[PDB]
Each structure stands twice: as C-alpha cells, then as structure tokens.
Design a protein around this nucleic acid. Structure first.
Ligand SMILES: COc1cc(NS(C)(=O)=O)ccc1Nc1c2ccccc2nc2ccccc12
Ligand SMILES: COc1cc(NS(C)(=O)=O)ccc1Nc1c2ccccc2nc2ccccc12
Ligand SMILES: [Mg+2]
Ligand SMILES: [Mg+2]
Ligand SMILES: [Mg+2]
Ligand SMILES: [Mg+2]
Ligand SMILES: [Mg+2]
Ligand SMILES: [Mg+2]
Lengths: 668, 655
DNA sequence: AGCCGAGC
DNA sequence: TGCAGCTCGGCT
DNA sequence: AGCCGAGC
DNA sequence: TGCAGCTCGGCT
C-alpha cells in the first residue's frame, strides 16, 4: 500500500514541459486534487502524495539517498538525473514534467515540507530553479471550484541571486546550526518588540515563512522551566484535571478527548505516544510519573518500545498530581484561548521544579534540550533550605530505582555505572546496567559478541544465563579463570561496557516570560524556579485573603439579614423589588462582596435574597452563625501565615503521599 | 507479521514443540514475554491480525494467495493432500501441536473455529491424533478432542456454504432455548454448539437491525452519544467515535464506529433518504459509491435538525436504557415517529440470516401513517430513493425493475441522465461506456464517442454513435443495451421485532403495521406520563402558591421555629409531601423541601404575582394536554417533522 | 464475480 | 489488528 | 551510525 | 499521513 502516482496523460511525451506534477500532503488531499482536476485536468497534471516529512538530502548519507522512497519516486516520475545540469532548453527535453507544484497544508509543518522539497532540488539541480521549476498552490465540490480558478491560487518561486542560496543553506545545512541560533534569536527578539506576490523568492520564503515553522518547532519541542512541560504535555494534564477520572480511561480515547478539550491541532497518535511517555515508570523514564501506567506501557528490557497499542492500555492521574499542582493555584494561571474556547494555561506552577524531576528533553531548530532526572526528596529538601535562607546543596542526577552509580567528573559531566561483582573464579554477576542502557540491547550488542567473538576479537566469555524480572537485571556470566583474570585486571566495568558518560551542556528552556534561555547549571534553574514559585505563593495568599475576606463579609451580611428578619426588624413580605433594594441600601447592607472583589480583579443583593426559606429556621440560623464565625477565623489564621508556610504545608503533604505511593510500588 | 520460531522447531524434537497462534501482535508480545527464557525452546508465537479465510469452499486462487493460510502451512511444514495417519507421516511437521490463543470473546471464538475449519478440511487425520488445543483467559490448557462423526457434522454445520438452512434451524433452537430460560478436554461438537454459537448469535444481534428504529446496536450507540453531547458545532468524526466508545461502553475497534458514523451521514443518491448526521467534508459521492470518503481524522459531523424531530426527546422517558458495567448506556431501541427501518433501507449480514430493505419515501410513509390514524388501510408502497430520477416498477412479489434514463437526441446522439440506483458513475464509465468505445478482446465497439457533464450529485453522459448502430441499439432496447436496468429483489426482510425476536417479514406493509401498533401505544404511554408529570407539577405549584400566600397573610411563620415543629405544622395544615417526588416514586416521612427551598425572593410582590401566574398556567397546561389524544400528539409531531423536512430538503436543492 | 457493512 | 521513515541538535 | 520525542 | 483481506447471506 505504498503512495501511488496518478500520472498526467501527456507526461513523458511531446508535451512534457507543459505538465505539472502536484505533490500533496497526504492521500486525502491527493483525492481532492484529482477530483478537482476532473477528466480534462488529468491531461497535464499528475498527483503524488507525500505522507510526511521527507529526507534532508543536503548532508544525508549516500545510503539514505539511494534507499529513500520519496526522493526516488520523485526522480523517476519527473525523470531527473543526478549530476545533469539543466542550463539549456536542450537539457530539459529529458524530463517527463516541466514543473512541480507543491500543495501542502497551509500550516507550519506544511511549510517545512515545501522547504525540504526546495532543499532537495536546490542541492542537486540548482540550474533548474533558474528556469523556475517550482510552484506552490496556496468537500469535492469545493475542490472543483478551487481548480477552475487555479491560476489565482498559483504562486511561482523565483531564484533571485546568492541571497537565495544562503537562505536555503541557512535553513537546511548541518554546518549552519550557529547561524540558525542567530537567525531565530533575531526573529524572537523582533517579535517581542512589536508586541510592545505572484512570485516568491526563496530568500523571502525562508525568512518570512519557513522561520515560522522553526519557531513553532522550538515552542512544541523545548520545555518550559516553570513546569517542565511542552504544550502537548500541558494539554494532556489540563484535560486530565478537567475530566477528573476516578477509573481508568483507554489511552486512545483519552487522546481524542485531549484533542477536543484542549484544541489540539495535530495527529492524535502523537498525543497518544506523549501520554504513554508521561505514564512510563521503568528505570530511566520518569522519577514521578503523573499518569498511571495501567497495562503494558513498556519495560527497561526494550526501553519502552514494547508498549502495547494505545487502543489496549489505560491510564488515570497519579494521586501525586494534584499534590504537585495544587488546584487552588489554577486561579493564578493565565489560561489560553483557541477559537474562543478556553484551553490549557501558559504554564502550570508546580510546588517543586518538575523540569528537574523527570528530566526534560526536546529537539528543536537551532537548539535542543537535555536534562537528567533529579531526586524529588533531595529537591524538596533544597527548597526547604532556601526557604530558611540557607544555601542549596549541590545536586547529582538521580534515577528512581537505579542500583548503580552516578559520579560527577566535572561541571555537567557524569560517569554512570552499572554493577558487576565477582562471584567465584569462573563467574561474574551483572546486576545493574547504566541508566538508559536497555536489557535486550546490552545482551545483543555486548554479551553475544563476547560469547561468539567477532572477526576482530576472540570470545571472552564462555556462557551467560539471564534471571531478570520486568524491572530488574540479572546476568550470570561464566568465564575461564585466566579470562576472568584479564578482564578483572583491565576494568570489569570497562570490559563489560557498564560505564557511560552523561553530559549536560544544552540545558535550554523557555523562562517564565516565554523567552528561550540557556542555563549553565541546574542551580541556576532551581534558583530561577524558586524566586518565581515563592512569588506565586505570595499571590496565592493575596488571592485567598481577598476571596475569604469577601466570603466573610458576605456571611456577615447574610447573618445580619436573617437575624433582623426573625427579630421583626425587616419584613420583605409583599414588597416591590424597588422598595426592597432601597430598603437594604439604607440599612447599610453591602452589595455582593464576592462579585465586587471578582470585578476589582446597581447594588446586588441576590446573595441575600436567593437564600432558601430554610434559612429562617432554628437549626439553619445557628448553623449560619457558626459558618460566619468559622470563616472569620479562617481569614485571620491565614493573614498570619507567610507564603513560605503555605509552601511548606504543600511540601509536607506531597512528601507524605510520595512515601505511601512509593512504598506501595515496592510491594505491588 | 513476524514469526518467533521455537529453538527446537524443525529438528528432532519437532513433535515436542507447540506453535502458539495469537489474536494480534500485543498478544504475541505478551506471550513471547510470558514464555520466559526457557519457553523459547519449545514454543513458537505467530500473530493473526483478524478473521482468516474460510477455506472449505474458497476458490483455488483464494487458498493459494492467502497470507495467513500459507504462513501457517510453511511454519508447521504442512503439505496438502498428505495424509497423517501413522507415526512415519508426522516426522515432516516442524511442530507437533498448535495452540490457539484468542481473545476470550465471541470474535475470538470465531477465529478458533476458522482455524479448526482449516485443519479439519485439509487434514482431518491430524485431528484424530489431537493436533489442536487452546489457552483460555498450565491449568489454562484445554485440548480439542475428536470424538466421532458428530464432530464432522458440527464443524460442517458452522462453516459449510451448503448448510445455511441448517444454521437457520440451529440458531432458531438456540434463541428459543434462551428465551424460555429467561424466566480438561473439549470435543469439537461441544465447541461449536456451546461456544461458537454464541458468536453466531451475537453476530446477528450486531448485524441485523431492529424493526422499531431501524438501527443496529453500534448505530444506536452513535445516536445515543450524539443526543447526550448535543453539539452546536461540528465534531471531527475520529473524535466522535472515541467519544461514542467511551459514553456508550462500546467494546470493539473504534475504526468500525468511524465507518458507521460515515455511513449514517451519507446523502448521495442511493445512500440515506434522510441522513441523521451531517456530512461536513468529503464523505463520499455517487461517483464512487462513497469509497471516495476522506479519512475520519479530516471530516466532521453533527446532528441533522431532523433528528430530534424524528426521535422526540420527551419520548426518552419511555425507553429501556441498557447497562454495561455499572454505566448506563443506549436504549434497547428508540421509538421514532415514522418507521426509519423503511426510510433509510436497513441492511446487514449475519450468520444464518441476512437483511436487505430498500429505501421508501418519507412523505408517502407519513401519509400512510396518517391514513392508519384514521382507521383506513395503508396504500401499497414502492421503493423510493431521494433525488433518484429513474423508475422503479413492480415485477412481482418483492421484485422490482430499476431503470435509469436514456433518450435519443438525434440520429447520432443519446443522453444518459440517470443511472440505476446503486450504479456508481465511475463504475458505469469504466465497465460500460469504455468497453463500448474501445471494444474488448471479446465484444466490439458500439459507440464512437462519449462526453461527461456530471455535477457532483447528478449524472450526464452524451454518447455519439453512427445511425446504423443507434438503430440496432433501439431495436435491442436502449436500456438493455446500455445496462440501465437492474432488478431489486427483497425476499430477505429479516428484522428483530420489538420483543427481541428475529422475524422474517413478507411485505413492507407488515413491517409498517407492526411498527404502527407499537408507536401508537407509546403515544398512549407518552400521554400518560405527561399527564402524571404535569399533574404533579400543578399540585406542587398549588402548594407553593398556598404557602407563600399564607406566609404573607401572617397565617404562618417559620421564623426561628425548629425543623420538627415546621414539618408537623405543614402536615397539620394539610400540605402535601413532594408531589413530583411521590409520582416518580410510584413509577416502580413528609418531604417539604420543594416549599422551604424556595428563595426569599419568593415572598416579594412581583414574585408573588409571578408564582400565581405560573400556577394557573400549569393548570391550563394540564387541561390542554388531557384534551389531546395519543393520535393528536402523533399528528403534531408529523406536522412539525414535515415542516422541517421541507425546509431542509429545499435548502439542499439550493446549496 | 463481486457488492453490501460491522466486526477482527 | 497492526505496520510503513524521516526532521531537528547534542552527544556518543 | 543511532538515540532521545513531537511532529507529518 | 496512510494502507494491508477477510466473514457471513442474498442476491446481481
Ligand atoms: C487476517 O487479518 C489480517 C492479516 C494481516 N496479515 S498480512 C500478511 O496480510 O499483512 C494484516 C491485517 C489483517 N486484518 C485487517 C484488519 C484487522 C483489524 C482491524 C482492521 C483491519 N483492516 C484490514 C484492512 C486490510 C487488510 C487487513 C485488515
Ligand atoms: C514521508 O513520510 C512517509 C512516507 C511513506 N511512504 S512509503 C513508500 O515509505 O510507504 C509512508 C509514510 C510516511 N509517514 C509516516 C507517518 C506520517 C504521519 C503520521 C505517522 C507516520 N508514521 C510513519 C511510520 C513509519 C513510516 C512512515 C510514517
Ligand atoms: Mg497540518
Ligand atoms: Mg521522560
Ligand atoms: Mg476482542
Ligand atoms: Mg443505507
Ligand atoms: Mg542527526
Ligand atoms: Mg460469499
């Protein structure tokens, strides 16, 4: 079921240079293109669908170029020849089509695909672009009307000088990473400032269109310092909070639900894989998985590649999630809008830097991000130290349930070791692989070549048996004692490849202001998170004091009303809204306190009059007095606490449950 | 599909080895996993990704090209025609046993049967040695045992094309024995008659629609979800499928929902006479009979305005909603105001029975329902397809001729302006006009040229011919020559009746009459329910009006009195315990909350006046309703539906 | 020989 | 019920 | 010569 | 982003 060409009738014959090959984004668009052309259109227009991102040929290997489906189909269809230059009219007589018309989604990923296509032709046949060989096109009845007016939707790329060569090269050469950081830096800065046509050159296309994809790539791929999330991830968590599921949801159904509630504009299978990623809890994945892995979500045996299909596995929130992201704090977040639907916030504000717990990592354009896992209790403890004006201890990466060793070689430089021990003089036991070394891989890339030997080396070991579980590693290895002697004389950890380095010189993240920023040490990250989170505890307090104050005023008025009613001092019986409103005002009743507070962020006495008739009864009077006083005491107790104290209460509540859950995990 | 061959497979311990066939990759994954380290020596795992070929009467070419069959043959080293009677013969096999490991559900069992069918047909001897076993979900290993000729009959009964009438009797008996009831080794015979029959039956339940609403359970779940969701904006189909799956506890692949949803939204000539979902996007055309629908991820839908008009919301109160795992789901059926099983032409393929019904005109059905409300006999009906421009005429009992349109323009030219229903434009072009133009290896060219002037929803061919050929064509009969006549035969109108029983209907009038009697009494039930409910509301309002009035005239006080004292006081003064709660109770101390929950606003002048007005309006509302007959209520509905039908259908002709 | 459609 | 290769940067 | 993951 | 072949009964 590979992609299928619908070849123009006149292709490869007398009228080849008059034929256009339409390259579309996916097969639906191919079907619609074909029906919009109709029978008369099929003469000079072919259609072939590209099913996703294609090879960057500029510095790909010869193998990749030879073996690539899309690249090679384009060549056969068009009749291109490597190394041929198309300078003359004469040279063009060997082509089956005279131009390619790119027809992709009018979105950023669409633009990326135009780029890769441009990159392709530019790298191999620049002499073609001089002839103007590339064009773009920017319900089946709607597709027919579009095509009858083809010329009005048809843009022609023009080559206009070396500035085009440089633009294309800037965007796609592996040698141009630093130029792209500069390019995008100028873009990003230029954009925060502003906050305060038949022909299209390649230069303009790169700098006015493709750059939008490049910036979007960064926005979806590089996590926020604040909550450790990428936008898709944040959309999943937002949906899960809103749904509040108390039994397991199938992952595919959760995916679709996230897509609806959060206005997710991409393929739901990306959402699915993301969900699987958030739930994983095997060694080297998440230190705290926010979703529960209910079913086969992958094991350390294959690094999670052995997860079952999203249609057959289930998940729900961890009991730790709302402890980490307290509900009350949602009141302080800037929620985003998409199509005037309210969606996920700009960022959540967790009580500890989640960006460090689960080890953010993404690859963008210009930058990429990698951070290892850090230990949660160790981070809780440093937040506590900072809350008391003490210095934070330095911190080593730490991966939950990892039995091995992480040693600091230098700044952002670590050696990571598994565990091997000598049992007898014929036997070693391997009980830990280094973090991110998966069991099957180690077995086939290390133990097998040791058993069988290679052409380069003779067999070092004699036998090995496996006694693993789903979550632990046990290899028993037999060796002649002469052989054991040598391996032991060399490094055991060395000979058996149980040492890997870990290097973190690209801790790139979006700061709370949404600016892309490079962090030298996790200390910087912790400090920047800390000032912000402390500040937001100030806000939570301001918000609560205001709110609870209004609720107290509200209750004072309500209680006063009831009491005066039963005492005969007011009557409302058979009196006009007009007379009642003014009567309340003159008796000094406050307009709705909670509404007036919410606004500040005629007089309204509905809060009083909407009360039920039960309110006047004996028990309901006593109860309202108790509520009024309770609420008064609530406001005051809270005015006395500091933001630090609030933070500490959260920390204590989180840790308590982290103990239960993790203790539970070690027995389940 | 990847095999994981057993380490000792094909060698000398071949017969000690066991090939585990699974239903799906995740299953093979879990099986390869759970085999442990030592399991790799003696056990192979190979996944089947779904229903396999029924080889018992398949063509030679089918058997020869089938991926699953031939993979299993290679892996086990089976050889056609080779008898495996003795010890010697068994040496060639690379495995000694096949262990079938399917889902523990009906479809699972069906795959088991297809596998049994396959081995039994080609190598019956192999089963006499006990070749096959299963893993139900070491004490999970069940062995299939051949115990005599009654096992050959049981397998043949389930899988032979020659045994449709026997399956009919088979399933009939099962259905009766279950209806009356509603008050380790394993022989093949017992497998077929105790396990496989469960699939056969629920295959019918999911494939053959109900008479009452013309839905199958999957369709019905879609509708249920759509009503609950109540969308005002379009929804992506793929997302709607998942939403349906979740809200109605659907236990199958969501891609099937997606196609079902698409099938319900289609409105091209030949599909639905009234599409209940809207086709927002490319959902298919008459050009390709819908096979040109785009992907479910890129098309959208929402309810048609006619949906709640055909399935009035108030009627939901009379339905029997089912339960799946503590969760309340769709009803056993909806009760529409006209028989939808006839409008949209229900059709489905089961085991033993199938169902085919053609479409009937909606207005003609409304008129017939009107005649019946008057005690007249319904006019006979003919199949009728919205926007079909041809002719459908009776040839006999449940047999019809369906004709397209062709006419001679001049002595060289004919126009074809309509194709028989269900003849798709592209197919007609490739399979008729092209051969007629180019000739074939067999037939000669008939025409000299043709040109197309189709719109998206109509058909227009202009054909050129020499005078000689045209005359010959007229002689033979134009409709016959250009294949513009189809017959339609309807001797398989099988449906589930309102009571759950599978039934054959000889005439559409019988379906109509049955549906009518049922819908009429549900209007009886709707009236009863409305009178009781509006009634209780009126009592409620009276009491509230009475309290508010007594309070205002100081004849009662609640101020500072205890809850015990208040309730007693209300009882003494003859106030009623919650009337609406009492009536909902009778649908199978004193509650006065409906009074004391009223707000203090209730005591103010304008609110006193307003409550008085509402009380009187409710009394009149009860009376206006008691004055209407079940029959009058039905007629109101039909009038409203028809008004909207005209509006909708007129806007389509304009768009 | 293949279409119709709800399942794998 | 499953599966079909790439992009982009850092680093190994 | 390939892994990490959010996209097509 | 797509695509891979079958069951089952009644007809054409
Ligand atoms: C037996 O069923 C299948 C076998 C294979 N194997 S192979 C070697 O041909 O590739 C592959 C797929 C299936 N089953 C299929 C489906 C199963 C579940 C849900 C949808 C399916 N859609 C299919 C579409 C075409 C072909 C097989 C499908
Ligand atoms: C260029 O992208 C694709 C090309 C093909 N063509 S071919 C001849 O190899 O079969 C096929 C698929 C793709 N794109 C893919 C995806 C696109 C969107 C969403 C998920 C995709 N998953 C893929 C998985 C494997 C291979 C290609 C995929
Ligand atoms: Mg797109
Ligand atoms: Mg992770
Ligand atoms: Mg199943
Ligand atoms: Mg239909
Ligand atoms: Mg690379
Ligand atoms: Mg058949």
């Amino acid at each position: 079921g590979i992609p299928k060409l619908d070849d123009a009738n006149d292709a490869g014959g007398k009228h080849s240079l008059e034929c256009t090959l339409i390259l579309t984004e996916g097969d639906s668009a191919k079907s619609l293109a074909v029906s919009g052309l109709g029978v008369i259109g099929r003469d000079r227009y072919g259609v072939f669908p590209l099913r996703g991102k294609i090879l960057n040929v500029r510095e790909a290997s010869h193998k990749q170029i030879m073996e690539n489906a899309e690249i090679n189909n384009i060549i056969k269809i068009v009749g291109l020849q490597y190394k041929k230059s198309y300078d003359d009219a004469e040279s063009l007589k060997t082509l089956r089509y005279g131009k390619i018309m790119i027809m992709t989604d009018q979105d950023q990923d669409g633009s990326h695909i135009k780029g890769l296509l441009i990159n392709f032709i530019h790298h191999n046949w620049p002499s073609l672009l001089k002839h103007g060989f590339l064009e773009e096109f920017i319900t089946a009845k709607e597709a027919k009307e579009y095509f009858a007016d083809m010329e009005r939707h048809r843009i022609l790329f023009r080559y206009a000088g070396p500035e085009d060569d440089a633009a294309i090269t800037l965007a796609f050469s592996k040698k141009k990473i630093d130029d792209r950081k500069e390019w995008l830096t100028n873009f990003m800065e230029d954009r925060r400032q502003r906050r305060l046509t038949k022909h299209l050159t390649y230069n303009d296309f790169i700098n006015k269109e493709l750059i939008l994809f490049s910036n979007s790539d960064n926005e979806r791929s590089i996590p926020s310092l604040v909550d450790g999330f990428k936008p898709g991830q944040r959309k999943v968590l937002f949906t899960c909070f809103k749904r509040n599921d108390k039994r397991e949801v199938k992952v595919a159904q959760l995916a679709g639900s996230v897509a609806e509630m959060s206005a997710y504009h991409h393929g739901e299978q990306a959402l699915m894989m993301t969900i699987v990623n958030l739930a994983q809890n095997f060694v080297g994945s998440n230190n705290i998985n926010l979703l529960q892995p209910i079913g086969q979500f992958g094991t350390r045996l294959h690094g999670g590649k052995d997860a079952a299909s999203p249609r057959y596995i289930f998940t729900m929130l961890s009991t730790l999630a709302r402890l980490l992201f307290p509900a009350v704090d949602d009141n302080l977040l800037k929620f985003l809008y998409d199509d005037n639907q309210r969606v996920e916030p700009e960022w959540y504000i967790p009580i500890i830097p989640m960006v460090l717990i689960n080890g953010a990592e993404g690859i963008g354009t210009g930058w990429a991000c990698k951070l290892p896992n850090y230990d949660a209790r160790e981070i809780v403890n440093n937040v506590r130290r900072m809350l008391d004006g003490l210095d934070p201890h330095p911190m080593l990466p730490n991966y939950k349930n990892f039995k091995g060793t992480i040693q600091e070689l230098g700044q952002n430089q670590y050696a990571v070791s598994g565990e091997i021990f000598v049992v007898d003089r014929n036997t070693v036991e391997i009980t830990e692989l280094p973090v991110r070394t998966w069991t099957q891989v180690y077995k086939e890339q290390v133990l097998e070549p040791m058993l069988n030997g290679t052409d380069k080396t003779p067999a070092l070991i004699s036998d090995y048996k496996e006694y693993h579980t789903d979550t632990t590693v046990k290899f028993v290895v037999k060796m002649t004692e002469e052989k054991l002697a040598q391996a032991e004389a060399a490094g055991l950890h060395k000979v058996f490849k149980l040492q890997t380095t870990l290097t973190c010189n690209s801790m790139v993240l979006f700061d709370h202001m949404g600016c892309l920023k490079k962090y030298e040490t996790v200390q910087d990250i912790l400090k920047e998170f800390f000032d912000l989170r402390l500040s937001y505890y100030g806000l939570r307090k301001e918000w609560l004091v205001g709110m609870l104050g209004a609720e107290s005023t509200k209750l004072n008025n309500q209680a006063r009303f009831i009491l005066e009613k039963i005492q005969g001092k007011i009557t409302i019986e058979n009196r006009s809204k007009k007379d009642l409103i003014q009567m309340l005002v003159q008796r000094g009743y406050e307009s709705d306190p909670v509404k007036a507070w919410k606004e500040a962020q005629g007089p309204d006495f509905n809060y009083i009059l909407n009360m039920s008739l039960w309110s006047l009864t004996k028990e309901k009077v006593e109860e309202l007095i108790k509520q009024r006083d309770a609420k008064g005491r609530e406001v005051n107790d809270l005015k006395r606490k500091s933001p630090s104290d609030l933070w500490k209460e959260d920390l204590a509540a989180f840790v308590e449950e982290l103990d239960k859950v993790e203790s539970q995990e070690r027995e389940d």
